[PDB]
Amino acid sequence: GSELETAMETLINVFHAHSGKEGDKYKLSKKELKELLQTELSGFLDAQKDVDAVDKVMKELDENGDGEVDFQEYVVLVAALTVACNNFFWENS
Amino acid sequence: GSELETAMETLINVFHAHSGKEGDKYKLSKKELKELLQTELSGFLDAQKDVDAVDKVMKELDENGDGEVDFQEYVVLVAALTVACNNFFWENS
Structure with missing residues (x-):
């Protein structure tokens, strides 16, 4: 480990x-x-001056508004x- | 922190x-x-029985064989x- x-x-x-919210285990809204x-x-989004960077991540949410994301996506955006x-x-x- | x-x-x-290998700072082959x-x-790839899962990540390398990956991709595949x-x-x- x-x-x-x-x-x-x-x-x-x-x-x-x-x-454990609306999903079950591997599901997350x-x-x-x-x-x-x-x-x-x-904190990060508070120490970053890149307004365009956050904008991409912000709008990205509307792109996958499907109502459910993906773990793989959780690790990439964080x-x-x-x-x-x-x-x-x-x-x- | x-x-x-x-x-x-x-x-x-x-x-x-x-x-720091072939790249410089944010670059990585x-x-x-x-x-x-x-x-x-x-260890993980040793504790995982999913042969198809690893296959996707293995072939994925050939897809981006461009010769250089991306940090965002480094965090998503790991x-x-x-x-x-x-x-x-x-x-x-």
């Missing part, structure tokens, strides 16, 4: 605890997930917010 | 350390990333392997 593998495990726990991503990463900030470190002088 | 936000941070560190995912999640195992817990009797 390395930290690398454990890091992902954390995404499973949180994803589940929230999957977009309405609930929409707040989830920002609920755990409320990170998309982080990388949308680290860029601050690497930049031209 | 909550554990939830820290979990994702781990993906950034590993992704970077490997981005598929050839190197291909081994990366399995290098850190060598997890795809985990979820391809947890299912063992939830199942019909």
Whole structure:
């Protein structure tokens, strides 16, 4: 159980605890997930100046408004917010 | 710095350390990333019986053989392997 593998495990726990809402186990409504991503990463979206980056993730919700997201999507969007900030470190002088 | 936000941070560190290969910082070759995912999640692909699941992730590499992947893709495929195992817990009797 390395930290690398454990890091992902954390995404499973949180994803589940929230999957108990309207869904059942692996099911999760977009309405609930929409707040989830920002609920755990409320700081990131606060340290990111990229307005276009958040816009893409915001509108993306309307694209999959199907009423249900996907775990694979939960892990991709949560990170998309982080990388949308680290860029601050690497930049031209 | 909550554990939830820290979990994702781990993906950034590993992704970077490997981005120093042929790439530079945010760039990473598929050839190197291909081994990366399995290098850190060598156990998962060992505890997963889903042959079709791994097949999709395996062929996916040939699809983006462009020679360079994407961070967003690094986080989505690494997890795809985990979820391809947890299912063992939830199942019909």
